[PDB]
């Protein structure tokens, strides 16, 4: 029974931060090619961030590159998303996924999803 | 730049048909893995299903198992989605999905997506 569950999620002004957080349970993280997908209306999906091939080698996005970091923890087996410097564009709901491809299961197992949202205060009145 | 153009959405009638295009850009589906997402409302995506491997192998999930269809067409370059004996359930925004991987790691795109009501 593999099964991600996402937190995290919420309100952010513009420069601010969070940290979406993704648990992993049914298998350990240490052995598949985790990822973060954005999906918000108008613009379908994309892969925001990847650690993958448990050498631990990580892809980001180059709208993302410099302000996100994605992380493991194997104790905890969970995947980790740091987002600083949050941008009106980084608003969507972000879901915590695996590849095309899982090792574990022979079909891709997606989250929930959380949503992030960033608005300034000029956009909130 | 890969893309991969939606297309064959629109409205069916519970136990018809209907058959998803996917036009791909930039690469070659046949040598690929690719899949169909699906978001359903009031619910998060899901893979509907994939074909991967060497083999040419598909998997479908438990919900579409004899149902749909994933195929791949070289001569257009495009990937079908096959989809019969719909379910009210089958109503959601399907998403085609493509893995290339280059320089040794798999990297994912997506579609724009296209829209499947199943109603009377």
């Known amino acids: 029974e593999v099964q991600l569950l996402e937190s995290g999620g919420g309100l952010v002004q513009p420069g601010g931060s969070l940290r979406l957080s993704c648990?992993?349970?049914?298998?350990?993280?240490?052995?598949?090619?985790?990822?973060?997908v954005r999906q918000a209306p108008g613009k379908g999906l994309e892969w925001?961030?990847?650690?993958?091939?448990?050498?631990?080698?990580?892809?980001?996005?180059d709208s993302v590159k410099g302000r996100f970091t994605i992380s493991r923890d194997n104790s905890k087996n969970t995947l980790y998303l740091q987002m600083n410097s949050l941008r009106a564009e980084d608003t969507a709901v972000?879901?915590?996924?695996?590849?095309?491809?899982?090792?574990?299961?022979?079909?891709?197992?997606?989250?929930?999803g959380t949503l992030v949202t960033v608005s300034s205060l000029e956009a909130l009145s | 730049e890969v893309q991969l153009l939606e297309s064959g959405g629109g409205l069916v009638q519970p136990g018809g048909s209907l058959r998803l295009s996917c036009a791909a850009s930039?690469?070659?589906?046949?040598?690929?893995?690719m899949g169909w997402v699906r978001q359903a409302p009031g619910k998060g995506l899901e893979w509907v299903s994939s074909?991967?491997?060497?083999?040419?192998?598909?998997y479908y999930a438990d919900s579409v198992k004899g149902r749909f269809t994933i195929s791949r067409d070289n001569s257009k370059n495009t990937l079908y989605l096959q989809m019969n004996s719909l379910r009210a359930e089958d109503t959601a925004v399907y998403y085609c999905?493509?893995?290339?991987?280059?320089?040794?790691?798999?990297?994912?795109?997506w579609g724009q997506g296209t829209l499947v009501t199943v109603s009377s």
């Open positions: 074909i991967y491997g060497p083999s040419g192998s598909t």
């Open positions: 999905a493509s893995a290339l991987e280059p320089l040794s790691e798999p990297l994912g795109f």
């Open positions: 930039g690469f070659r589906i046949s040598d690929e893995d």
